Write a protein that binds this ligand. Structure first.
Ligand SMILES: [Br-]
Ligand SMILES: [Br-]
Ligand SMILES: [Br-]
Ligand SMILES: [Br-]
Ligand SMILES: [Br-]
Ligand SMILES: [Br-]
Lengths: 241, 241
């Protein structure tokens, strides 16, 4: 709400992400993050994916998160659109579902008819593709290794967690989820890949208030990853686990 | 042009202003600055005006800088509008001219007819007045002393310099001014109180490119003040004086 306030908040975020050290200087991680034109949590998870051996997947995920409407859901074809979407649904959640969508598009030869059949916006995937190429070019310039996790997608989940631990939520016994940061009651959106399999712990990309305070893009986590990637930030009960 | 880049730049600014120490922690100055909803250079000069004994004037100046069109200049009354404006012109420049305008408005009983006579936008002064009251309320909450410099307006110039040293410019022998920060050729606007008395050294509020790269709101400085208020930032030849 004021230049100084938001600057201080952003500085604190950088420290917790590992971008700044105890003396407030940029770390190697911070320097690398700074080369990308993304918001800091996205930069963090991209760099970490290099260390976690899943930068091939993360480049795609980051690009998919940077575009708007990937799926469309016509009023008269809702069950069909949901059926086609659910085929992409991954058990680990929304980020890996976005990866699945992009990879399928690629494997089906970047086909507009295929996008139409599956209720996917071809224009959004094309923009995602452009962004990915840009991000890959930055990776290559600064010798940041691009590798795939293959079937070991737990490494993708961990990388997301290393960036978005601040957005951790634990399932509430009575209703929805409670955020760890300030105990806000939040919910998994009906469109989420996790809506019918709501796990104990998640991180979310962002919060959006519509019908309820909804989490947008949720990924399943192990609570121990919070301590692994943000050991100063969490207490084995700051915020309890 | 990217979240990380602009954040790093803003952090560097805070350090040079004295808002952050060598370990990147908020100083007493930084903590005080953070209570105001202004851009950091404005916050700096407001806090410093407390130490320099001119916070009465600075509250007014900061409020006047926070509003849009104070003077108006009708096409058919240009010489008259300029004549009425020049009556407010202070030898030290634009910031002290803004102070003179507000104080005269007050001394003439906040009169709309008076504003009309002098080609001043009454609505802009009213908004400036509202902002001043808000800023004064923040000063009072945190026990930041409000005092006047009286006739010793050099203290106002020094306070401006302590905040805006980054925007220092030295007069170029051949044409206009050269900024100290990156040697950009810049000019005093025809509307400035300093246009017909262009001094050796100035600081400016901002740069605006119109007909030329124009400095907007210039105040005369002594180059020694740059060393006084930013001793690590300037060389007695970083940037030469
Ligand atoms: Br690193
Ligand atoms: Br983000
Ligand atoms: Br888009
Ligand atoms: Br102070
Ligand atoms: Br400013
Ligand atoms: Br205004």
């Amino acid at each position: 709400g004021s230049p100084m306030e938001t600057l201080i908040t952003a500085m604190e975020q950088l420290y917790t992400l590992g971008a700044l050290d105890d003396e407030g200087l940029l770390t190697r991680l911070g320097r690398r993050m700074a080369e990308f034109p993304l918001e800091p949590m996205l930069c963090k998870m991209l760099i970490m994916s290099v260390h976690l051996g899943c930068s091939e997947e993360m480049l795609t995920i980051v690009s998919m998160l940077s575009v708007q409407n990937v799926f469309y859901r016509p009023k008269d074809k809702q069950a069909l659109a949901d059926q086609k979407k659910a085929k992409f649904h991954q058990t680990e959640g929304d980020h890996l579902t976005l990866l699945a969508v992009y990879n399928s598009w690629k494997n089906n030869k970047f086909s507009n008819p295929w996008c139409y059949e599956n209720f996917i916006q071809a224009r959004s995937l094309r923009r995602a593709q452009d962004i990915r190429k840009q991000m890959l070019g930055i990776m290559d310039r600064h010798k940041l290794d691009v590798v795939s996790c293959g079937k070991s997608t737990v490494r993708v989940q961990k990388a997301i967690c290393s960036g978005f631990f601040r957005n951790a939520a634990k399932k509430d016994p009575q209703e929805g989820y409670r955020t760890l940061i300030d105990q806000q009651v939040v919910y998994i959106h009906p469109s989420s890949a996790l809506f019918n399999r709501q796990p104990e712990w998640v991180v979310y990309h962002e919060l959006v208030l519509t019908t309820k305070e909804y989490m947008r893009e949720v990924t399943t986590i192990d609570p121990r990853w919070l301590v692994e990637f943000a050991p100063a930030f969490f207490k084995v009960l700051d915020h309890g686990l």
